[PDB]
């Protein structure tokens, strides 16, 4: 005998004889127990079916719960009943065959040709075979006579749920399961396989129930919750109801009674069987046991998101895992996670003792479960476990171990774990991290690791899993490490990169006017691992001064060249070449930063074709990780060495600006009033293709938008060109031009669903305005700023405009989840073969070559096989 | 006869023949291939033997 | 359960939820038969 694997599953309909022969007992009695005697013979709780309480031996097999599979029973039904789930099939078995001779009502020769074609095409073209059988069924149903026996056939109409009423030249006759089974028993095997069925495994008369299988107790365990009487589940109650109806019908028919009550009781028994197979039958009253609640049956046992498929098969609860709130930690590497001591001493990893790591494991064993690092259990080679909590003296036990033992030690530094944040939209939402144990109670994540997880520290929690096998750990370390996944697969560009304080610090350190003394340089460089020769100061006299670019240049490789603009080169700083009075153009030659600043366009995350992107692409994720660990901390250190605050004086504008804003607003209002006044007397030439009352709204919206833009420009011009808010806006750290415009100048026009606010009273939004007023103020134009403050109706209009954001989020996330689930299930089984083709696991070909040139998006230079201009730059950029 | 013999990793570094014979005659109650394949979840090597 | 002692049985490791699914499928009239295969791939 050999250990095997599951290679396939063959389905079918379970034969009544097979049910009889697989069963161990026959259920005869109708009481579940007597005087709490559940081992009562012949009941549903007969011990021969199975055992569920801890201490007991199964009568059928001398095994306990550890090795006792459930055993099935059989109930001999006296009146045949029909399966509710199979009705449609037997429906197609009634309208497509003769009632008397039990044969298909298609003539002989064409039927033989059809079956020959079907057998010749059944396996190669399953869809064509399905079309053929459906066509045969359609053309056989529409025949009212049987050529084989020369008899005239009536028609049968289906009535929900399970009763078939045939028409027989008037006086519609209700059909009984016995005659239906007799009719279906006559269909030959050669004709039942022509209809798309299997005679040797799914025989139609087996589809009519004569013997019912009784599931074991292991499938329907008795629950003794609430510290009271044991509460049986729905299956036992429905089964015993079916049994008692069976004996009632048997005794009633054997005693003699009118056939009307007999058939009514037969219908009731059929109802019990149907509600046992499935409770939520449309148009039927659900069964309720004692509390007026609908029962849960076999169909309900496999349904929803809490059933078997989506509750215990597709997804399941696993151990060796934890969930905890996350907090920032900029002192960790980009592939490290900080865990508390309590979790480290609870989750363990099993390490097998060898001749190389025996002293370390002995030291682990010497420390108890309560001392870190330590161990919790020791597994002997025999397979028995020893708990270190109850060990009398583990000091000698540590010396007693040899190679072959297994020790469950605590998590230590350098251990590989899986770190995850739901909803897990894409593949890098779950990554392999290295453990570091720190005091506290939260998981610690580096600030650069947030974008892949889409996490921010507003109270989010994340999950941690500990692989427990050598192969799983090796795969996680070699394929799922964080630093190996800097570039996202959606496009060619880094997903891990500079955030918000990093960009501001980089800009402030890289600017032309930064000069540092020796002590300041030492303080800045003390946070990194750099030690060595600083070189001569950039400025020698009168006072020895370094510079920000010189400190930055200590980390770039000595053959790196880069020419490109910065994020601050959008406004009046655009010099479009190397001769720039501003630091608006980046020039790096042979690893020396000669001019330009660092901002979002040089170190920012999700910025393809930046200097960070090329640096990673040319010096590996190794240099990418080293750079992100070293140079990104000087930015924070210099930011806190300098001062970075936000004062209210960065938003206030001088009173001379407010007068110009007011004049512009008055001009715009006068223009709108002129439009409206001339609209009331015709005098308007509408935009071609548009009607009156549609051109007026367009004119008003256009002039209001132009007024908003002009006011924003005026506010920006008269503000301080170098303040913290403007710096954050231009460098791309936080904010935008629109936010600055709204804070310093007028908010603009509020709109709901792309149109001005109109819902309210008749011909007016609020009761503060005149009837039929379409002035800019009356429809939601805010002429104030957040700094200046809003009037009450402006507050109302702002809230009305902004309400949509609080609503759209749930709809968006639900639709995205549904679409992604369908798309995943559609594209799950595709693979790339060794010849470059894209093929499904079933063999068929999707693409002759992946993409068009077999290039991975992750390894591409922003959706491009290779940037030839970048190569020319990399070669000869030091002499451009 | 033709069969498959499993060689545990602890017996590595030695010629296949004697180990193959040892496990063959150890539990039953020959030129084996010098190379064998590895399956998922087990480190032992499976060799084809003509015994 | 049907062949008694006239058949050879093989052990397979599997998720217990799958075995529960098989058992509750046999509770209905569906009969799922598992086809076994060799653990070791010959060649």
């Amino acid at each position: 005998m050999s250990e095997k694997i599951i290679r396939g599953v063959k389905f079918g309909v379970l034969s009544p004889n097979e049910i009889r022969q697989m069963s161990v007992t026959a259920i005869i009695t109708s009481e579940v127990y007597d005087e709490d005697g559940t081992p009562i013979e012949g009941g549903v709780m007969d011990p021969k079916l199975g055992v569920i309480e801890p201490g007991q031996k199964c009568p059928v097999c001398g095994n306990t719960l550890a090795g006792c599979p459930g055993h099935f029973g059989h109930i001999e039904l006296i009146k045949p009943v029909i399966h509710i789930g199979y009705v449609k099939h037997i429906y197609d078995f009634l309208r497509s065959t003769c009632w008397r001779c039990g044969r298909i009502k298609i003539k002989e020769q064409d039927l033989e040709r059809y079956k020959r074609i079907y057998n010749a095409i059944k396996l190669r073209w399953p869809s064509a075979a399905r079309r053929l059988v459906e066509y045969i069924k359609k053309i056989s149903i529409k025949n009212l006579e049987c050529p084989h026996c020369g008899e005239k056939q009536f028609k049968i109409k289906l009535e929900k749920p399970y009763n078939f009423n045939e028409e027989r030249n008037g006086s519609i006759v209700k059909l009984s399961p016995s005659e239906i089974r007799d009719r279906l028993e006559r269909i030959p095997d050669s004709d039942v396989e022509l209809l798309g069925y299997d005679p040797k495994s799914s025989r139609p008369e087996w589809m009519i129930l004569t013997v019912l299988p009784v599931p074991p107790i292991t499938i329907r365990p008795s629950i003794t919750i609430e510290s009271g009487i044991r509460a049986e589940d729905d299956l036992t109650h429905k089964l015993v109801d079916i049994i008692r109806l069976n004996e009632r019908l048997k005794e009633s028919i054997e005693a003699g009674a009118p056939q009307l009550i007999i058939e009514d009781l037969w219908d009731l028994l059929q109802y019990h069987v149907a509600t046992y197979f499935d409770n939520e039958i449309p148009g039927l009253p659900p069964a309720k046991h004692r509390s007026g609640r609908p029962l849960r049956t076999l169909a309900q046992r496999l349904k929803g998101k809490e059933g078997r498929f989506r509750g215990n098969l597709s997804g399941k609860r696993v151990d060796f895992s934890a969930r905890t709130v996350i907090s920032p930690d900029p002192n960790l590497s980009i592939d490290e996670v900080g865990i508390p001591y309590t979790i480290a001493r609870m989750l363990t990893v099993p390490e097998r003792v060898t001749n190389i790591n025996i002293e370390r494991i002995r030291q682990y064993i010497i420390n108890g479960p309560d001392k870190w690092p330590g161990a919790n259990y020791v597994i002997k080679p025999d397979g028995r476990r020893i708990d270190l909590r109850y060990v009398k003296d583990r000091k000698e036990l540590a010396s007693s171990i040899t190679a072959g033992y297994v020790v469950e030690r605590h998590l230590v530094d350098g251990d590989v774990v899986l770190f995850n944040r739901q909803p897990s939209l894409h593949r890098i939402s779950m990554m392999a991290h290295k453990v570091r144990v720190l005091p506290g109670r939260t998981f610690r994540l580096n600030l650069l690791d947030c974008p892949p997880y889409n996490a921010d520290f507003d109270g989010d929690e994340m999950n941690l899993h500990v692989p427990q096998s050598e192969e799983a750990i090796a795969e996680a370390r070699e394929l799922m490490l964080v630093h190996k996944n800097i570039i996202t697969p959606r496009y060619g560009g880094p997903i891990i990169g500079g955030g918000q304080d990093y960009i501001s610090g980089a800009y402030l350190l890289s600017v032309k006017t930064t000069l540092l003394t020796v002590e300041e340089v030492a303080t800045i460089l003390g946070v990194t691992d750099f030690v060595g020769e600083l070189g001569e100061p950039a400025i020698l006299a009168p006072k020895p001064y370094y510079t920000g670019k010189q400190v930055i240049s200590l980390f770039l490789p000595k053959d790196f060249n880069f020419h490109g603009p910065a994020n601050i080169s959008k406004g009046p700083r655009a010099c479009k070449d190397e001769i720039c009075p501003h630091d608006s153009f980046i020039v790096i030659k042979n690893g020396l930063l000669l001019e330009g600043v660092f901002d979002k366009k040089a170190i920012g995350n999700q910025q393809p074709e930046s200097m960070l992107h090329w640096s990673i692409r040319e010096y590996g994720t190794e240099y990418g990780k080293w750079l992100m660990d070293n140079v990104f901390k000087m930015f924070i250190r210099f930011l806190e060495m300098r001062g970075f605050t936000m004062t209210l004086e960065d938003i206030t504008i001088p009173d001379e600006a407010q007068n110009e804003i007011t004049t512009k607003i008055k001009e715009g209002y006068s223009q709108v009033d002129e439009y409206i006044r001339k609209f009331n007397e015709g005098q308007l030439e509408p935009i071609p293709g548009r009607t009156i009352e549609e051109s007026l709204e367009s004119y008003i919206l256009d002039t209001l938008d132009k007024l908003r833009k002009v006011a924003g420009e005026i506010a920006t011009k008269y503000l301080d060109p170098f303040n913290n808010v403007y710096i954050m806006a231009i460098t791309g750290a936080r904010g935008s031009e629109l936010n600055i415009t709204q804070m310093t100048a007028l908010l603009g026009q509020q709109s709901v669903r792309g149109e001005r606010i109109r819902r309210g009273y008749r011909e007016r939004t609020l009761s503060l305005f005149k009837y039929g007023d379409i002035a800019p103020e009356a429809r939601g134009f805010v002429k104030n700023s957040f700094m200046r403050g809003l009037s009450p109706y402006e507050m109302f209009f702002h809230a009305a405009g902004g309400r949509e954001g609080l609503v759209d989020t749930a709809v968006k996330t639900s639709q995205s989840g549904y679409m992604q689930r369908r798309l995943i299930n559609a594209l799950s089984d595709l693979r790339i073969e060794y010849d470059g083709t894209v093929r499904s696991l079933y063999g068929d070909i999707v693409q002759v070559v992946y993409g068009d040139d077999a290039v991975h998006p992750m390894y591409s230079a922003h959706s491009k096989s290779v940037n030839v201009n970048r190569v020319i730059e990399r070669v000869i950029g030091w002499k451009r | 006869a033709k069969g498959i013999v499993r060689i545990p990793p602890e017996y590595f570094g030695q010629s296949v023949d004697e180990i193959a014979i040892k496990i063959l005659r150890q539990e039953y109650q020959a030129k084996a291939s010098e190379e064998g394949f590895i399956i998922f979840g087990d480190g032992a090597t499976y060799h084809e033997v003509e015994f | 359960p049907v062949h008694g002692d006239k058949s050879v049985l093989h052990p397979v490791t599997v998720s217990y939820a799958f075995k529960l699914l098989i058992q509750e499928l046999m509770s209905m009239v569906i009969s799922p038969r598992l086809i076994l295969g060799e653990k070791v791939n010959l060649g």
Partner: peptide, 7 residues
């Protein structure tokens, strides 16, 4: 551990 022995 399997054999797949045949004669």
């Amino acid at each position: 551990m399997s054999y797949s022995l045949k004669t």
